[PDB]
Amino acid sequence: ATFEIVNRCSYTVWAAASKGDAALDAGGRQLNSGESWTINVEPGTKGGKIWARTDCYFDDSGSGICKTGDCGGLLRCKRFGRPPTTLAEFSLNQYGKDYIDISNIKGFNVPMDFSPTTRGCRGVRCAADIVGQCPAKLKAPGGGCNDACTVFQTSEYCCTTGKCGPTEYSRFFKRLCPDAFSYVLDKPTTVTCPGSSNYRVTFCPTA
Template sequence: LAHTQAATFDITNKCPYTVWAAAVPGGGKQLTNGQTWTINVAAGTTAARIWARTGCNFDGTGHGGCQTGDCGGLLNCQAYGTPPNTLAEFALNQFNNLDFIDISLVDGFNVPMDFSPTSNGCTRGIRCTADINGQCPAQLKTQGGCNNPCTVFKTDEYCCNSGSCGPTDYSRYFKTRCPDAYSYPKDDQTSTFTCQGGTNYRVVFCP
């Protein structure tokens, strides 16, 4: 592979409260207001995601749990988190050596997010900063966040298990507030962004 350099991701918490950042691959770290955690992600990594966890308690061995985004009770995530969680998703050095990045609300929303390239001449970032929790439809409201309809209703219409689903009133709730983010699983056209491979990135909670 010509491009073997890892990509750097700077993960910063600008929320007025503590979050426990999570990354797969990468693990997890408690971030108080203003703190940054930097991870290096190997070239060619796919199906990766970064998110914030809220309302966490961990013991000295890194076991415990979180109100939102919990990953099997571990501080150092090895697996994806539990909805609702606002997701930064990415795959590096894919087709034509492009990185594919997105913010997804397919697993619901817990913390506002900015996901942006910081190098390589790539300038198009993604933001989702609306008050989605405050205005969340009653059926989707949950402790600390706004759930996705698949988690709540578990029907094919919302979960897209058959692969032939379209937008719904619930997905439009998210889409109108965060037009650059995935609102349901087939929302690719308006929600996936690319940079040349070898780009570095930042994720900011509560930008």
């Protein structure tokens, strides 16, 4: 499957793509404002994620640091990124269908649209100014808006027992972005697409 990753932000981002225990395609690349990077994701990829990283520095070997979404200091991500990270999430070719969503469960750094480029389903979007409106206690000094689990490490926010409810913090993310997961047991906003669809992830879709 092809994923065109497009940076419409006025600032550089470093795109990342991983399934947690491996890179997807090259795993990461710099995207200046306006740049597009097309990756190939193997059919059947389960639990894949694409995200943006901000304010990165990498040496000539591709080692360094990002202020949001850092993946063990690598340009080419092999693992998931450090919150806060707005997440485009996907599982492909799962019994004949693809499943896509956006999640704020690991916080928010960059607005995103995640849409099919092929027929048969709708896209999802979280493009509100979550960083600007972020509750004081969730603001990440490094940049972005942390989820409450990251900040407070409680069973309730992290849904450790599988018994959690919505919270004042989750409701903030849900209010700003109804179409993204705000906590682990949120009413799903997952979209079912035809198996083997192709996609575009656009950072800063509205600005």
